[PDB]
């Protein structure tokens, strides 16, 4: 997202020099690359101390947010915003039956 | 009336606990005090069954990481899931 800006330009130069039947290949703007806002994956409390039959509803709602890349409420999105994947952290004080 | 005073054969959820506590303490004396199983029941019935239901998934629970004669009952029903 930031580290990729180098590799793109070297690859573009390789194809720009090669083309003798033309000049000037186009590019997409910088905010296509830099922004983690156009991708799907861009206060709090410990979930474990809650009653069980409220914990299930809260954790299920958070997980459904988590699957589509949106940061949770009692699942925190660990820092990235470079390459591919991302990781998430549910609290380790969550009840065992739910946690597994 | 006062009643014919129900026997130990009849009453079985309070005298049952009394007998369970008593034979547990008797066995603990007959070894010396190095056995140590409190609680004739506990946690509940449904909690232990849900625990064992999670044992059959093949993962962690609240009594494993995957009277006092409950352990003999518990071993064959946990060993299904192991």
UniProtKB/Swiss-Prot annotation, chain A:
The source's domain of life comes to: Eukaryota
Location in the cell: Cytoplasm, Cytoskeleton, Microtubule organizing center, Centrosome
Q: What is known about the tissue distribution of this protein?
A: Ubiquitously expressed.
Listed under subunit, the entry gives: Component of the gamma-tubulin ring complex (gTuRC) consisting of TUBGCP2, TUBGCP3, TUBGCP4, TUBGCP5 and TUBGCP6 and gamma-tubulin TUBG1 or TUBG2. TUBGCP2, TUBGCP3, TUBGCP4, TUBGCP5 and TUBGCP6 assemble in a 5:5:2:1:1 stoichiometry; each is associated with a gamma-tubulin, thereby arranging 14 gamma-tubulins in a helical manner. Gamma-tubulin at the first position is blocked by TUBGCP3 at the last position, allowing 13 protafilaments to grow into a microtubule.
Per the UniProt record, the associated disease is: Cortical dysplasia, complex, with other brain malformations 15: An autosomal recessive disorder characterized by global developmental delay, variably impaired intellectual development, speech delay, facial dysmorphism, microcephaly, and varying degrees of cortical malformations including pachygyria, thin corpus callosum and subcortical band heterotopia. Most patients have generalized seizures.
The text of the family note is: Belongs to the TUBGCP family.
Q: What task does this protein carry out?
A: Component of the gamma-tubulin ring complex (gTuRC) which mediates microtubule nucleation. The gTuRC regulates the minus-end nucleation of alpha-beta tubulin heterodimers that grow into microtubule protafilaments, a critical step in centrosome duplication and spindle formation. Plays a role in neuronal migration.
Query: Mind telling me what this protein is named?
Result: Gamma-tubulin complex component 2
Task: Look up and give the organism this protein is from.
Answer: Homo sapiens (Human)
Curated annotation (Swiss-Prot), chain B:
Q: What do we know about how this protein assembles, alone or with others?
A: Component of the gamma-tubulin ring complex (gTuRC) consisting of TUBGCP2, TUBGCP3, TUBGCP4, TUBGCP5 and TUBGCP6 and gamma-tubulin TUBG1 or TUBG2. TUBGCP2, TUBGCP3, TUBGCP4, TUBGCP5 and TUBGCP6 assemble in a 5:5:2:1:1 stoichiometry; each is associated with a gamma-tubulin, thereby arranging 14 gamma-tubulins in a helical manner. Gamma-tubulin at the first position is blocked by TUBGCP3 at the last position, allowing 13 protafilaments to grow into a microtubule.
- Which residues of the full-length protein are shown here? 305 to 405 of 1819
User: Could you tell me where this protein is found in the cell?
Assistant: Cytoplasm, Cytoskeleton, Microtubule organizing center, Centrosome
Q: So what family is this one in?
A: Belongs to the TUBGCP family.
UniProt-recorded name of the protein? Gamma-tubulin complex component 6
- Job description of the protein: Component of the gamma-tubulin ring complex (gTuRC) which mediates microtubule nucleation. The gTuRC regulates the minus-end nucleation of alpha-beta tubulin heterodimers that grow into microtubule protafilaments, a critical step in centrosome duplication and spindle formation.
- Where would you find the membrane-spanning parts of this chain? none
Disease note? Microcephaly and chorioretinopathy, autosomal recessive, 1: A syndrome characterized by microcephaly, cognitive impairment, underdeveloped retina and choroid, and epilepsy in some patients. The more anterior parts of the retina, near the periphery and pars plana, have a grayish hue and diminutive vasculature similar to retinopathy of prematurity. Visual impairment becomes evident during the first year of life.
Species the sequence originates in: Homo sapiens
């Amino acid at each position: 997202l930031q580290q990729s800006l180098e590799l793109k330009r070297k690859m573009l130069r390789d194809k720009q020099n090669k083309k003798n039947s033309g000049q000037h290949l186009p590019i997409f703007p910088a905010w296509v690359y830099e922004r983690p806002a156009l991708i799907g994956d861009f206060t709090a409390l410990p979930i474990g101390t809650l009653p069980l039959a409220s914990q299930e509803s809260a954790v299920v709602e958070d997980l459904l947010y988590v699957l589509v890349g949106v940061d949770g409420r009692y699942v925190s999105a660990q820092p990235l915003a470079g390459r591919q994947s991302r990781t998430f952290l549910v609290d380790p004080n969550l009840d065992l039956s739910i946690r597994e | 009336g006062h009643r014919e005073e129900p026997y130990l054969t009849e009453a079985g959820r309070d005298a049952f606990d009394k007998f369970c506590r008593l034979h547990q303490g008797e066995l603990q004396l007959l070894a010396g005090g190095v056995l140590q199983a409190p609680q004739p029941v506990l946690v509940k019935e449904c909690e232990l069954v849900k625990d064992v239901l999670n044992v059959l998934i093949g993962v962690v629970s609240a009594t494993f990481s995957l009277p006092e004669s409950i352990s003999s009952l518990l071993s064959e029903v946990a060993e299904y899931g192991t």
